[PDB]
Amino acid sequence: ISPIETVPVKLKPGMDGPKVKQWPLTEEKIKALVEICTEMEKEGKISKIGPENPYNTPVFASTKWRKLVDFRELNKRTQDFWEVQLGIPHPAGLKKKKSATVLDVGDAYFSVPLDEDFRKYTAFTIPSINNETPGIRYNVLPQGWKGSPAIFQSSMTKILEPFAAQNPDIVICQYMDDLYVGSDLEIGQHRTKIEELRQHLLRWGLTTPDKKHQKEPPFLWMGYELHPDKWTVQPIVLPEKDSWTVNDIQKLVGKLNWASQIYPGIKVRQLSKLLRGTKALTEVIPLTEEAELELAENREILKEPVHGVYYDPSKDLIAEIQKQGQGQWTYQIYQEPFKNLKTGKYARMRGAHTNDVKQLTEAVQKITTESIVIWGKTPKFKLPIQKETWETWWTEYWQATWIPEWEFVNTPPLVKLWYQLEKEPIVGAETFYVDGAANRETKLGKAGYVTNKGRQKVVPLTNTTNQKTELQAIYLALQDSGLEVNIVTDSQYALGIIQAQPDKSESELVNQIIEQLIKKEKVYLAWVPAHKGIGGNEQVDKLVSA
Amino acid sequence: ETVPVKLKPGMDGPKVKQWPLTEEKIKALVEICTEMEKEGKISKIGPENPYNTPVFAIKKKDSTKWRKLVDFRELNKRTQDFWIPHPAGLKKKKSVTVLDVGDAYFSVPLDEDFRKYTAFTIPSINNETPGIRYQYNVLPQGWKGSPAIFQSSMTKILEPFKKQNPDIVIYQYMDDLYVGSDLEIGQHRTKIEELRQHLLRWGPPFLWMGYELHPDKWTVQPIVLPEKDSWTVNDIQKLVGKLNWASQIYPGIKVRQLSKLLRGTKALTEVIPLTEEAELELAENREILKEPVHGVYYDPSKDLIAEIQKQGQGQWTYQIYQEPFKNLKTGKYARMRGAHTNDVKQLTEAVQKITTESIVIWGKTPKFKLPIQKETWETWWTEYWQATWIPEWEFVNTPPLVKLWYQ
Numbered sequence A: 001i002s003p004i005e006t007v008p009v010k011l012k013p014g015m016d017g018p019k020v021k022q023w024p025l026t027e028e029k030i031k032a033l034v035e036i037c038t039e040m041e042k043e044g045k046i047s048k049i050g051p052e053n054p055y056n057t058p059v060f061a062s063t064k065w066r067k068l069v070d071f072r073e074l075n076k077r078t079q080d081f082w083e084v085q086l087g088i089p090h091p092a093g094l095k096k097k098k099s100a101t102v103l104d105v106g107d108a109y110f111s112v113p114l115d116e117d118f119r120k121y122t123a124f125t126i127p128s129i130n131n132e133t134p135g136i137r138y139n140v141l142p143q144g145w146k147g148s149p150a151i152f153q154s155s156m157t158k159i160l161e162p163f164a165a166q167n168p169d170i171v172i173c174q175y176m177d178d179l180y181v182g183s184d185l186e187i188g189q190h191r192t193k194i195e196e197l198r199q200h201l202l203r204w205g206l207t208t209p210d211k212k213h214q215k216e217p218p219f220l221w222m223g224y225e226l227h228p229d230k231w232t233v234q235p236i237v238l239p240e241k242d243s244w245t246v247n248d249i250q251k252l253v254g255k256l257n258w259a260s261q262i263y264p265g266i267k268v269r270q271l272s273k274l275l276r277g278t279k280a281l282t283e284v285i286p287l288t289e290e291a292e293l294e295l296a297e298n299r300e301i302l303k304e305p306v307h308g309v310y311y312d313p314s315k316d317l318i319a320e321i322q323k324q325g326q327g328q329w330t331y332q333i334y335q336e337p338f339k340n341l342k343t344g345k346y347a348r349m350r351g352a353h354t355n356d357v358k359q360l361t362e363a364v365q366k367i368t369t370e371s372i373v374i375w376g377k378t379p380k381f382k383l384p385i386q387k388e389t390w391e392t393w394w395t396e397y398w399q400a401t402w403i404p405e406w407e408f409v410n411t412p413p414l415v416k417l418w419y420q421l422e423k424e425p426i427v428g429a430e431t432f433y434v435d436g437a438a439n440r441e442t443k444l445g446k447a448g449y450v451t452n453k454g455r456q457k458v459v460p461l462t463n464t465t466n467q468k469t470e471l472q473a474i475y476l477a478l479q480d481s482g483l484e485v486n487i488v489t490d491s492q493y494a495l496g497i498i499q500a501q502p503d504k505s506e507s508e509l510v511n512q513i514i515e516q517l518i519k520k521e522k523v524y525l526a527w528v529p530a531h532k533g534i535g536g537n538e539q540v541d542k543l544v545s546a
Numbered sequence B: 001e002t003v004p005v006k007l008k009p010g011m012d013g014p015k016v017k018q019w020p021l022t023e024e025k026i027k028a029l030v031e032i033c034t035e036m037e038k039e040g041k042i043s044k045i046g047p048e049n050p051y052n053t054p055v056f057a058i059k060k061k062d063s064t065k066w067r068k069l070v071d072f073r074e075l076n077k078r079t080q081d082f083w084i085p086h087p088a089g090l091k092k093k094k095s096v097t098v099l100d101v102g103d104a105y106f107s108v109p110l111d112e113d114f115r116k117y118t119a120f121t122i123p124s125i126n127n128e129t130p131g132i133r134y135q136y137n138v139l140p141q142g143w144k145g146s147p148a149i150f151q152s153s154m155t156k157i158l159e160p161f162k163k164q165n166p167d168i169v170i171y172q173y174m175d176d177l178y179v180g181s182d183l184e185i186g187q188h189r190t191k192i193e194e195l196r197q198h199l200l201r202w203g204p205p206f207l208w209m210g211y212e213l214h215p216d217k218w219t220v221q222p223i224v225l226p227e228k229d230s231w232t233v234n235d236i237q238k239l240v241g242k243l244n245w246a247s248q249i250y251p252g253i254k255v256r257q258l259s260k261l262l263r264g265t266k267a268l269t270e271v272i273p274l275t276e277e278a279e280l281e282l283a284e285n286r287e288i289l290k291e292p293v294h295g296v297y298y299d300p301s302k303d304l305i306a307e308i309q310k311q312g313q314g315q316w317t318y319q320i321y322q323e324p325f326k327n328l329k330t331g332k333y334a335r336m337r338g339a340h341t342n343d344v345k346q347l348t349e350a351v352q353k354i355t356t357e358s359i360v361i362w363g364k365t366p367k368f369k370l371p372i373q374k375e376t377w378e379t380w381w382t383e384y385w386q387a388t389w390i391p392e393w394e395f396v397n398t399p400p401l402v403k404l405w406y407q
């Protein structure tokens, strides 16, 4: 049946129809608008309406130009619909077949009819030259309408549903305006089934030209290029201009990002750091040498051509991660050794205090999430961390944390715990009661410590907040102490930052505390309530007060 | 026919994106949904319906059969409130068995206008094909209105058995049913089977299974003070800190004498004898903790809140409260599942148990404070869930440090 059932569309609740007066344009423009417009009515795309309809929408526009209509006002009045996922299938998930044909659909939007009662809101009055003619007042899915994509896709779905069931041997992936079909039957049968499907489309008014031979492989998808047994991104290009602008950074980062899918080792952190302000695409920012080196390294890997294999459910799914350093991580997902399904990169989520273990865990979830999306199953992980390192970490962590089934891979740099804090006080280690204060009105402040041996110290500080002195009081105790030391503090802030077990921080003082912690053999950090008169905590708090 | 239902005024239909599903779960949903469509319980929907409710598959404990599950938590909050009394005997009953009665909910149709709010989408892998869109034509499992609309029918069904066994306590939670008696387990199971046949006769893929509880064995974990003979400075420090923390719950706690022992700057490892007066202060504090906190009683209007702490060695602590420091219940689980391999599973098992204990006692689920990062919980929490309901939760990314108090 040529008729295709139309989806009911209703204007937004309590919303009126769109009425926008057409802007006066040149006569040559209206001389062509009424030209194509008459053809569309001959084709049945549009129908002239009586003067009763009040709604209106503006109409603007090689050898000739094309028509257009801005239904944004109409779109605002139009109701919300289920939206097709913007995600595009990644080739790494695409399974291998003997033949693969791509059937494009011609004028899918125009081919799809529209809800009868909604057609009143698509009126677009036609302009008249010099107002010398009465204004000329859609029957199908209009181009540019909010509900057009979903309606056309949803319409196609119901259309294709019967053919799929009748021919389960063929697999038909659905994407906007395109229809990708593959099968493992003989080449003659595949071409045969392709024609059967095209006829089923015509029976509902759908043109998928095979007369013009469908583009044979290779196929260049909008995302990347594809082949019968391999997939790769479109070739990259390197300007190598002596001076780069702001818009140069985004273009290079964007193009490099797309390359990280198949080409391992891509790094964009240094480049992104250069465009910190990114004030104006026209603004020009000088290149840094660290970023320049990143491009030089990126250029090396980019030179060699790379390809990825398609997925085989029989083969296992493996993901391998390595630490690039400075918060950068590269991973590879492969079913067969040396042959990668896909490659990617992860960057540290914004934070003030971090360590290697957590960042690795974060990468797993990022890989795990992408894997379930592209294949529907978690991969086995080859991780650069000793099983004992992980057991110590996750068991001692205060939060719940877990990593899927994984194996150790000896490829450096390995993930390790740079320092571990004792759970019980170190007997025979000098005890350091610490406290630090700072005036709110005057940034000036002080920080010091007291010990059981009588040792003491107080240091005046300037341009310091109360918390900084609390951490500053700990730095001193670490420097002026031996390899084994107990530290008693009242600062929950300092404790909450050390019980987070960081190995690199955005605060230089934290790093210097980390550096002493790495140096020391054993360190036990205890906490006591402030102003509770607990031991030397009151003695050390008084010395640093104001 | 049907009962009218509308959303709370000013609240639109729930629209929640369908989180990506494993291929195994995607297949299971297609088979369940494909048969239900044949049964007419669900029907396809076009793009006109912009609402969406998440759906995923689960397998009950010791169950090889996939059960469809829909996250109606957003729809439930948007659904207009109704207008069941919660029996206290369940907690005292020696045994309480749970039965999945959600199948009966499918017999009753639902209003057409509200059916648009039950839209759920079966996802597709690698965005290869547009996901399948379904809508409930009957009372959907996991909905708030489903147990209420069917409630009257459930009573008429359970009327004869209730009269036959008045001592037995029956309580119904959405998609579930709890039956409690003090009889022996053998007779209890027999009565349960009799009740199963009762529903079968008036009518269940999961009706045969039975979950056994013993609320009589349930007990609350109290806050205790270690009794030692050699008290070190660090012991007194930690001991004093805990007591000062517990003062918020119990004002009577005093820490003066213990602080006196701390006077002076001494090493943590040095042992400090406890003065007789300090030992008395510890004794008086030890007594105050053996007694219940005053003015602590459940308020039906206030929602329950639950917090979990990862103590370690496969041990977890939880406290259920309606006010910041007014604790209604406190306990600790141990060896739940994957005790020494996977916390996410232990936390998922803990969230379930706590909810069960909450339902048996107050007929409603608490809001959970999950000691876990959001991305960690959202990635795997679906793989270990074995219940028909889903409570509320938020994540606490700040180190409490108070776990030692809840030891």
Ligand SMILES: N#Cc1ccc2c(Oc3ccc(F)cc3OCCn3ccc(=O)[nH]c3=O)cc(F)cc2c1
Pocket (backbone or CB within 6 Å): A089, A094, A095, A096, A097, A099, A100, A101, A102, A171, A172, A173, A180, A181, A182, A183, A217, A219, A220, A221, A222, A226, A227, A228, A229, A310, B128
């Ligand atoms: N431009 C373009 C284009 C062409 C075919 C596509 C495709 O076609 C396929 C359709 C169904 C299917 F099962 C498997 C497909 O491709 C599997 C991968 N592949 C492809 C080509 C080939 O020669 N060999 C091979 O293995 C599936 C798909 F998402 C996107 C496609 C985009």
Ligand SMILES: [Mg+2]
Pocket (backbone or CB within 6 Å): A435, A436, A437, A490, A530, A541
């Ligand atoms: Mg102080």
